[PDB]
Amino acid sequence: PEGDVTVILNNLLEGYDNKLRPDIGVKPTLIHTDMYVNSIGPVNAINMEYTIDIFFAQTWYDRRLKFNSTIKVLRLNSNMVGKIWIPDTFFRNSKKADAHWITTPNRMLRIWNDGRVLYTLRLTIDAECQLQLHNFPMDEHSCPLEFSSYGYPREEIVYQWKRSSVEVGDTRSWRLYQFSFVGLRNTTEVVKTTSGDYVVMSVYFDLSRRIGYFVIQTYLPCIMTVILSQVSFWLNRESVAARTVFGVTTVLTMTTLSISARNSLPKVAYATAMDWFIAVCYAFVFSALIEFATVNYFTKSQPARAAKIDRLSRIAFPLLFGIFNLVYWATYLN
Amino acid sequence: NITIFTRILDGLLDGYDNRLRPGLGERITQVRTDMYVNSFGPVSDTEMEYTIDIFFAQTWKDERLRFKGPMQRLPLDNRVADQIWTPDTFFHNDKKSFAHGMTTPNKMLRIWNDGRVLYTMRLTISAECPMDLEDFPMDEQNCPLKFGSYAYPNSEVVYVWTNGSTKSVVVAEDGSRLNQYHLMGQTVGTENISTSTGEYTIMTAHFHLKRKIGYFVIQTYLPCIMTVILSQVSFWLNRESVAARTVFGVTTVLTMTTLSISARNSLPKVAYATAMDWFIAVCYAFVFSALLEFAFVNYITKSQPARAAKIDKMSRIVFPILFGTFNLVYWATY
Amino acid sequence: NITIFTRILDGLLDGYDNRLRPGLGERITQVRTDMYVNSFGPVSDTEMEYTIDIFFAQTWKDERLRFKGPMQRLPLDNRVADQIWTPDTFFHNDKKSFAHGMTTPNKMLRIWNDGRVLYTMRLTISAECPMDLEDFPMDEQNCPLKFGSYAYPNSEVVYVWTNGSTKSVVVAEDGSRLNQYHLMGQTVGTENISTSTGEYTIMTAHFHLKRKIGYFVIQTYLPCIMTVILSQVSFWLNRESVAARTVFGVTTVLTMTTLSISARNSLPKVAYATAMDWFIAVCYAFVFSALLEFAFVNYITKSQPARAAKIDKMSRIVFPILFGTFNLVYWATYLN
Amino acid sequence: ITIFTRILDGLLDGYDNRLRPGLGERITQVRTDMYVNSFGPVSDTEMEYTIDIFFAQTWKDERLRFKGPMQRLPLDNRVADQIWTPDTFFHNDKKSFAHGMTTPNKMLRIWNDGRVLYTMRLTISAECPMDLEDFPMDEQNCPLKFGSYAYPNSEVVYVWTNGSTKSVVVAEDGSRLNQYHLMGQTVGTENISTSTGEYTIMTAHFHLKRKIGYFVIQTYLPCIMTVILSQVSFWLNRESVAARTVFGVTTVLTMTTLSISARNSLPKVAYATAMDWFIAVCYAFVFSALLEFAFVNYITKSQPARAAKIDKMSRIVFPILFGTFNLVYWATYLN
Amino acid sequence: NITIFTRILDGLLDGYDNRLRPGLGERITQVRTDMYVNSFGPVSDTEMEYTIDIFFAQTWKDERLRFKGPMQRLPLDNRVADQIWTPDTFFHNDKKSFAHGMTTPNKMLRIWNDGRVLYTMRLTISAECPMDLEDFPMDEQNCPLKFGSYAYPNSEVVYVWTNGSTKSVVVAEDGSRLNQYHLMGQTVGTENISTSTGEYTIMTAHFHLKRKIGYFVIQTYLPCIMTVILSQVSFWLNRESVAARTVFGVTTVLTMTTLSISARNSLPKVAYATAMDWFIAVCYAFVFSALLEFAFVNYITKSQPARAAKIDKMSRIVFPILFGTFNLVYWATYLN
Ligand SMILES: CCCCCCCCCCO[C@@H]1O[C@H](CO)[C@@H](O[C@H]2O[C@H](CO)[C@@H](O)[C@H](O)[C@H]2O)[C@H](O)[C@H]1O
Ligand SMILES: CCCCCCCCCCO[C@@H]1O[C@H](CO)[C@@H](O[C@H]2O[C@H](CO)[C@@H](O)[C@H](O)[C@H]2O)[C@H](O)[C@H]1O
Ligand SMILES: CCCCCCCCCCO[C@@H]1O[C@H](CO)[C@@H](O[C@H]2O[C@H](CO)[C@@H](O)[C@H](O)[C@H]2O)[C@H](O)[C@H]1O
Ligand SMILES: CCCCCCCCCCO[C@@H]1O[C@H](CO)[C@@H](O[C@H]2O[C@H](CO)[C@@H](O)[C@H](O)[C@H]2O)[C@H](O)[C@H]1O
Ligand SMILES: CC(C)(C)OC(=O)c1ncn2c1[C@@H]1CCCN1C(=O)c1c(Br)cccc1-2
Ligand SMILES: CC(C)(C)OC(=O)c1ncn2c1[C@@H]1CCCN1C(=O)c1c(Br)cccc1-2
Ligand SMILES: CC(C)(C)OC(=O)c1ncn2c1[C@@H]1CCCN1C(=O)c1c(Br)cccc1-2
Ligand SMILES: CC(C)(C)OC(=O)c1ncn2c1[C@@H]1CCCN1C(=O)c1c(Br)cccc1-2
Ligand SMILES: CC(C)(C)OC(=O)c1ncn2c1[C@@H]1CCCN1C(=O)c1c(Br)cccc1-2
Ligand SMILES: *[C@@H]1O[C@H](CO)[C@@H](O)[C@H](O)[C@H]1NC(C)=O
Ligand SMILES: *[C@@H]1O[C@H](CO)[C@@H](O)[C@H](O)[C@H]1NC(C)=O
Ligand SMILES: *[C@@H]1O[C@H](CO)[C@@H](O)[C@H](O)[C@H]1NC(C)=O
Ligand SMILES: *[C@@H]1O[C@H](CO)[C@@H](O)[C@H](O)[C@H]1NC(C)=O
Ligand SMILES: *[C@@H]1O[C@H](CO)[C@@H](O)[C@H](O)[C@H]1NC(C)=O
């Protein structure tokens, strides 16, 4: 058993050429690929990237590895991956890709009597995903993970999936706070370039954001500040300093609140759905102050208008904000 | 003699195929595993992970290493560990890890006449610890450490804990080092899982934790409790002091708003409220209600001075009781 | 078929000394280089650097790798790149870089019957991009990428860009997107530099970019413009409301102060003023002037109530116009 | 030059570096010395510290004995890999590395006796658990446990050179810390029975005292200037209700903000420090001042003589009661 | 020709023991060293360190490398550097460093018939720069770079700077720019140090720098100077406006507190006051004094309205001068 297998391996590596692909000049090696996502790491819209942990696998046929024996498979470790030919698979949108070396290189190599080889390695990848976060925090995104051969175009190497194209793991372990995993799709294609026409393989992951954090962190404090600014309507104009504090301080906070909200988010040039919510709330607050200045400029001389303004503001200002909230939420809710 | 051992080693490694597990084709390789946590590393709530510095030991029997010599055990370095076969154990929930290398690789290989091998190594591991923070900061968390072989299913390699479950995992009393958590205890487990690459035996070591409330008492609860008490001082002023009463309300409502965002920045951006969030939420209600109380009394102070005065004298007893009772119910609940 | 190529490789590497460049003592090794930017990495103003993920190709001829066989090319792995001689190209302005390694090293070696070698690799490089930020946030920056041999001067190794067909610098539409900058274009160059260790030929790839103003409009300009307008609302109150008028000025001057420091923390610690700094300066002057206007009015309201009241009526129209005219000149100046 | 090449080959010819010198015959004794090139930044938040040392070990290897004209053999790191060296490891090590530029920073010197001198430069980040009750008037001791990993005391043993005094030296220029004084160093050795054998771990303790200057400028002065500001309210009349309120309401929150701010930079420890208590009473003094005004203003209309009196009295009792607190506070924690 | 050089290399390395330095037992190996700073990296005040990208050259004589051939020198790669002996020079004050490796190790070996070796390499080094910040931000700091052999004392290996025709230390004009510092100059040095493992000769490269005040003028000084004048605006109000006067003092006093903590958060946590700290300290005194002025004025405005009013008029001219007089002495003191 042990001695037999030892000779089967030595007899397959004596005249073997790691530097040469199988089916060189004969046919295109077919690689049946599969993928198991262990986790979906933190999404970093700042650098427009995201982390992913997977068990990636490639299965090709190598003629030089045919052996006659009673055993079916040669369950081996990673020590043989360097002594056989391995595809030059690389990821076209990866910012960095790392392997796992504890306790041993996290790779397995399985060989069949037919010459079929199963090679799967654990990987963690930081893939680039440009995000159109315009509906933020009510935005929907799909992020790819492209991979193809680096040096063997379509003529030499080709890829295709199984029916188990992708297999997701326990979603609770996944560290995705602001997003929720929903979709997963696969695509095959051939992109033309100067070095050749390579067959590229992509797998999109679909993520829908959550408002829970931002609702508590931004929308609520914004909704309560406009309300506070409208309590100023239920005070007299005699206490000018009082209602002046009301307006001056509320426009101050809606300002700081906006900067505090955008600081933790990517520095995008355009405006997001939240920035709009923060913008119009600032107007509801700023409009409440100028209202008092107008009422004050009229109170001393003409208390006619200066009195009926507050009567109508106490109805419009609160009711005009609520209608806006319905317009905002319902527009994005569905 | 030193020369005697030199020949013994060469004889064992001469013709030794480390690509094959011991007992291939005859018996499944049983791997008894022990663990000693030299220190329990910092837990990163934001990252939902934890660090740990352990001595990870594995022992199995290799007939090919059976030797007869003067000394019955062979204290060796890491140099020989690479030349023989060792299990390819990997930690499933591992994020990023490494084996200490100074001054030399922190590894130990000991072989016996029987052929039994002892292979222990020092590892610092960062692993996923998914957490539910509903009861934060009065929460208990359990952090796993799943590990097993990558290329050898149970049909080829099997793992088992030493001396039963008891005493399999040890933690240095100096090493239980957490600023924010108590390390209650540890419990081990073993389970087979059928996967598309075979049925592997994964072994898990769970670390249970209870959060320390002291830090948040000083950083969040006291600032909140003292700010609501500050807002209630407004009741002991006259409605005539509109600006003064306003200063109390205007200031305490925004202070409470700021404390929320401040307290929330250090935490993971989870889309659900925690026990701290609710506590802050009512404290915001208590302060905002106080400001609304003054707006009401000040609105009727001229028309119903007896009622306006009544609501002031009433706020001085109902507000503190309703808040004191909330803390009684709040702190008693958790 | 397969055995034929194994023997071809063995024949080429048999007696091959990779320590010597091809043509040593007869001809200088000319290295034609092409480049394809897979993605233009994040630009760090604070660190005065930028990252880039490129496919860097070099092609030269090695008289020793001449072979005759069926197929004209030799698709090989990186394993052979270490066994033969390759140029020691290095990026002069490089800070830190690395070569992608998963699943295998991102490298490709192709040898032809002629002996010509094609040696391409994927590299992510962070390089220095010194910036002059006078026109910040309305500034344009040019980031270089100098590279050449380290041990072989022009007398031994020379670099040259490819012809037009194989564009010298290409940039993937997938990779150039940046949140804060527009990638205008790229221009290449070649130059010899005489050094105490020889005259080397360094080749440069410049990437020109102009910053996007959208982010700063929302984070700094609007808060400043709304804070000066807020301070001017003080004019619509009566001098009798002394505390109220003070609250406007005292708060808006510090609001402008806080906006400065906040806007001032995120940028590189440059020791000179930018176009944004001046803008903040004028908004602070307008806000501080508004508060000073009330202090003057309130000081003479007792002695010259006719003068004190009237200047409050004109301050309502001179301040906004004088500020609106300032914005008109400001935004027109730095946009052209 | 040619003579020594043969000596090296003769020693390494048939030399098995996989076996320790004296395997099965004698225990390998390793005398150890240490020189701290620089004491690295101490991270209170991370409860760790960095250190850059020259770590020397000397043991006797009979297989390396030789007779020649020279007295020893000055060599590079090239030979260190070819011979046997101890597998020393730092138990409390978090993350460390051996400097490599321009070449591996290593030194091998072999004597006719067979004694080997093996020193290397190491930068080590190690855990230093701290108790911060007396922070920022606190003293900390950071250990450095090291020993063999695979060879117990029955096979390899460590001992300090020159005795426990001057065994460890620290460059006066390199012990640069912004926040701590490096008082001194004390060495130690102890055997510990473990499930893989009884190893002899050797420890190097680094005692530190925190510098109070930084916190005086960032926390204490801002707090003391804010409490006195709150007391200025007493020098105003109850008639200025809004003014008196502005004083109290603002100073109490200034004190609140200083607390949260001062604690953000520190480790998230679940217990109060000497800085926390100081801030706590400063919050009591400012809150008391505001409560004082609330009391006078509530009784100023019914008991103007008592309410007015309580203002004049607060202008002297509050400063004294606070000034006396600082006297006891600074004397207690600086003693 | 190529085969000729292959035989030359084999002849030099045949029987060559790279474990032994040239001249063991015959001559002490003298290593003349040159240095070229490709870029002076960012200086980190908080971490008390600095980064530097250099070309570090060393030249010595190895008898065993004597060859006779057509070419005088031997342009080679790093491959031969590992096969021959090279000095084990190390930078004492190094924090963390690395040698650039892309595309190949940035290294250069040149051998002349005489046996003289030229060995230069590209290095990025982070080293300690102990700093004294008493005069911060108007201070001068000097960052060293002491280096020497690790295993060979002066009796076996000796280092010396390039005596003539090459400035011992060179700094690229393209790389020297720094956002926060001016690179005044560089000074070299050599010194013997007696150690328990021998007397080594360390060679030093001092880089002197003076900090740029532009950033701190706008971030700390102007906000402080503009806040002190704001507090003095209180003098232009009436004592009757107690709340208004109070708003001025309490607000400016806390603004000054915030500026202090803010300005120090970005700086190293040193336990001593700097020139900026003192500046902030007195600026806090001036604002606190202004609030103290009103508190005194407001207390006697009813009993001594003539005195209370009188001091408000002199405070309007004594405070600005008393602050202006401080700035004149302050800025003249530390800027000369
Ligand atoms: C009156 C005029 C306006 C003056 C405004 C002055 C105050 C500015 C608000 C600051 O708000 C905080 O800013 C941090 C950044 O400074 C954010 O940090 C978050 O985001 C950062 C960047 O993404 C990370 O570095 C942090 O770890 C993370 O907590 C944080 O969420 C946010 O609440
Ligand atoms: C109602 C008016 C408007 C109010 C708007 C908000 C005002 C500013 C609040 C800032 O609060 C701080 O934010 C830091 C950055 O977010 C936190 O840093 C902590 O958490 C960060 C993220 O985890 C880390 O990066 C830091 O190191 C750590 O100190 C810190 O705890 C928190 O107190
Ligand atoms: C009345 C209630 C008012 C509402 C609460 C106010 C919240 C804002 C407090 C800001 O305080 C600052 O927070 C920084 C970030 O937390 C700290 O940074 C320091 O500490 C951080 C964490 O250790 C580091 O990340 C920074 O680099 C370092 O400068 C800094 O020391 C601290 O003064
Ligand atoms: C009135 C009573 C309450 C007292 C005041 C409370 C608020 C404290 C002011 C905070 O000011 C900011 O603090 C940051 C640190 O906390 C600094 O970050 C700077 O320095 C940090 C550490 O050096 C870096 O991490 C940042 O990137 C860098 O922007 C930043 O410059 C500074 O404006
Ligand atoms: C199906 C696929 C090719 C995507 O498979 C891998 O890529 C792979 N590679 C390694 N392993 C796996 C399988 C796949 C299913 C889950 N799974 C594992 O997680 C696992 C485990 Br539990 C233990 C040891 C090895 C693996
Ligand atoms: C418990 C377990 C089997 C998992 O541990 C080891 O097998 C191991 N591996 C290495 N070491 C040990 C022992 C065991 C107890 C902890 N312990 C040590 O701390 C230690 C020491 Br003090 C010095 C040298 C080696 C070790
Ligand atoms: C142009 C140049 C010679 C400098 O080319 C490379 O260096 C290179 N190296 C690898 N690849 C490329 C070509 C170049 C054009 C785009 N391009 C690729 O992106 C790509 C792709 Br889509 C799939 C497989 C390999 C590559
Ligand atoms: C103290 C100890 C024996 C543990 O130290 C070394 O064995 C060692 N190892 C390396 N070096 C040394 C000597 C010893 C004194 C400090 N010292 C040095 O700093 C130094 C210098 Br200046 C230049 C070149 C090498 C060294
Ligand atoms: C000055 C010194 C001897 C210490 O420098 C080198 O020995 C060295 N080492 C590498 N290189 C150089 C020359 C010398 C002048 C600067 N200089 C270079 O910048 C450079 C260039 Br442009 C291209 C290729 C190699 C180098
Ligand atoms: C393996 O099996 C095939 C098919 O039966 C046969 O042609 C070949 O000769 C066998 N090889 C050996 C070594 O037995
Ligand atoms: C994509 O995934 C689905 C679901 O597993 C599978 O049915 C389909 O065959 C896959 N397509 C490709 C091209 O991999
Ligand atoms: C570079 O060197 C070549 C060959 O000597 C020369 O023709 C060319 O003009 C040089 N270029 C520059 C810019 O000096
Ligand atoms: C520990 O073991 C060593 C070596 O046998 C011995 O010298 C020493 O006395 C023992 N114990 C102590 C406390 O030193
Ligand atoms: C160092 O020692 C050598 C040998 O005695 C001497 O030539 C040299 O001048 C000394 N250098 C210094 C700085 O003392």
Numbering used by the authors:
A (entry chain B): 23 to 330, 438 to 463
B (entry chain C): 14 to 322, 430 to 454
C (entry chain A), E (entry chain E): 14 to 322, 430 to 456
D (entry chain D): 15 to 322, 430 to 456
Original authors' sentences:
To solve the structure of an α5-γ2 site with higher affinity we co-assembled four engineered α5 subunits with one subunit containing a complete γ2 ECD. We crystallized this construct, α5V2, in complex with another type II BZD, the partial PAM, bretazenil, and solved its structure to 2.5 Å resolution. Bretazenil is an analog of flumazenil and retained the same binding mode at all five pockets, which closely resembled the α1β2γ2 pocket (RMSD peptide Cα backbone homomeric and heteromeric sites versus α1β2γ2: 0.73 Å and 0.72 Å, respectively). Inclusion of the γ2 ECD did successfully recover a higher apparent affinity site (the four lower-affinity sites were also still present), which had only 2-fold, 5-fold and 15-fold lower affinity for 3H-flunitrazepam, 3H-flumazenil and bretazenil, respectively, compared with wild-type receptors. Of note, bretazenil also possesses an additional five-member ring conjugated to the diazepine moiety, but is nonselective. This can be explained by additional compensatory interactions that the bretazenil oxytrimethyl group forms with S209.
